[PDB]
Design a protein around this ligand. Structure first.
Ligand SMILES: OC[C@H]1O[C@@H](O[C@H]2[C@H](O)[C@H](O)[C@H](O[C@H]3[C@H](O)[C@H](O)[C@H](O[C@H]4[C@H](O)[C@H](O)[C@H](O[C@H]5[C@H](O)[C@H](O)[C@H](O[C@H]6[C@H](O)[C@H](O)[C@H](O)O[C@@H]6CO)O[C@@H]5CO)O[C@@H]4CO)O[C@@H]3CO)O[C@@H]2CO)[C@@H](O)[C@@H](O)[C@@H]1O
Ligand SMILES: OC[C@H]1O[C@@H](O[C@H]2[C@H](O)[C@H](O)[C@H](O[C@H]3[C@H](O)[C@H](O)[C@H](O[C@H]4[C@H](O)[C@H](O)[C@H](O[C@H]5[C@H](O)[C@H](O)[C@H](O[C@H]6[C@H](O)[C@H](O)[C@H](O)O[C@@H]6CO)O[C@@H]5CO)O[C@@H]4CO)O[C@@H]3CO)O[C@@H]2CO)[C@@H](O)[C@@H](O)[C@@H]1O
Lengths: 141, 141
């Protein structure tokens, strides 16, 4: 079979997802009209870090809508091993864009990070975050 | 917080959900246009029994669309303890109806059952099966 398991982390955010903590640094988190808004401080390379309290994801792909004033680095991490893995760096956009990214990390992951890579304080807006156990090329919304 | 975790088991079924086996008895399973179709044999009290291969659900609520020629019993079970729990019996309907049911079982569950309770061979059609960690009254699709 080709069928995946799709985990909806959040659709329209007005607060944190059930069963997640924020282990982020160097930013203020707020919400508007269903979007999670990251407001990083200049010089801190700030990020949101969504921490799954119980369990872990393995491989698969991450799907989300994002708009962003600057370049944004996407990472995943394993909190037990304390290892991190850089998935992609995404260019700036004034409009929301849908991304579907393969996660090639060789460990399970319980942290998903969206980071202000240039460290200039550029804001980030996220909607519609979903994990699939399958590949990005096989992802059906 | 009031926010739940929503697990989509299947939306439009053309086969079994990823990570589930069928432990059903006394019926033939088929599919049409996104519906899982249970064809039970007269006298067998047949059922589909969706078995989660890894992990278990705890409490919460089950949401699904169903149409059904006869009365249908909904159960959940814990395969380790080998204990079962009767959630509801639902009357016949010639059209699909959306149900959202609280699960009051005192153990985790890894089996979800849809059964031909009268044992006359009446067919059952299921779409859009989702579990929430929260109550039926708080369930937002
Ligand atoms: O309270 C809750 C629990 O907390 C636990 O402790 C947590 C803690 O809360 C936090 O989550 C922490 O997270 C780590 C994370 O694991 C990871 O190591 C992360 O690494 C960061 C690093 O710190 C920097 O932010 C780094 O920034 C770089 C940029 O990404 C970029 O590459 C940039 O490039 C520039 C380049 O260097 C040059 O200047 C060029 O000219 O310009 C470039 C920019 O245009 O360089 C930046 C700086 O190097 O990114 C990495 C990757 O994200 O850091 C965070 C924070 O430390 O984890 C701990 C757990 O270990 C526990 O305390 C628990 O008990 C609590 O319950
Ligand atoms: O191969 C895969 C693995 O299989 C494992 O073994 C599984 C096995 O495959 C299967 O899944 C089995 O499932 C059990 C289940 O756990 C549960 O015990 C279930 O119980 C049924 C019961 O058998 C009857 O079907 C019962 O029917 C009643 C109706 O619901 C209704 O109440 C009806 O009412 C009538 C009344 O009696 C009277 O006649 C009145 O006038 O009219 C009424 C009708 O109008 O009465 C019916 C009969 O009592 O329903 C219950 C509840 O659903 O039974 C199934 C099947 O046995 O579980 C095992 C695991 O233990 C392992 O082998 C593994 O190794 C494999 O890998």
């Amino acid at each position: 079979n080709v069928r995946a398991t799709y985990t909806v982390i959040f659709k329209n955010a007005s607060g944190l997802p059930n069963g997640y903590d924020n282990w982020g640094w160097g930013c203020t988190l707020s919400y508007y009209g269903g979007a999670m808004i990251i407001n990083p401080q200049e010089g801190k390379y700030g990020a949101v870090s969504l921490k799954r309290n119980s369990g872990s994801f393995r491989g698969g792909s991450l799907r989300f809508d994002m708009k962003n004033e600057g370049k944004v680095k996407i990472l995943v991490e394993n909190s037990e091993a304390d290892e991190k893995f850089e998935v992609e760096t995404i260019s700036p956009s004034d409009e929301y864009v849908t991304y579907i990214l393969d996660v090639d990390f060789d460990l399970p992951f319980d942290r998903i990070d969206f980071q202000d890579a240039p460290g200039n304080g550029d804001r980030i807006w996220i909607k519609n975050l979903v994990h699939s156990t399958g590949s990005a090329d096989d992802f059906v919304d």
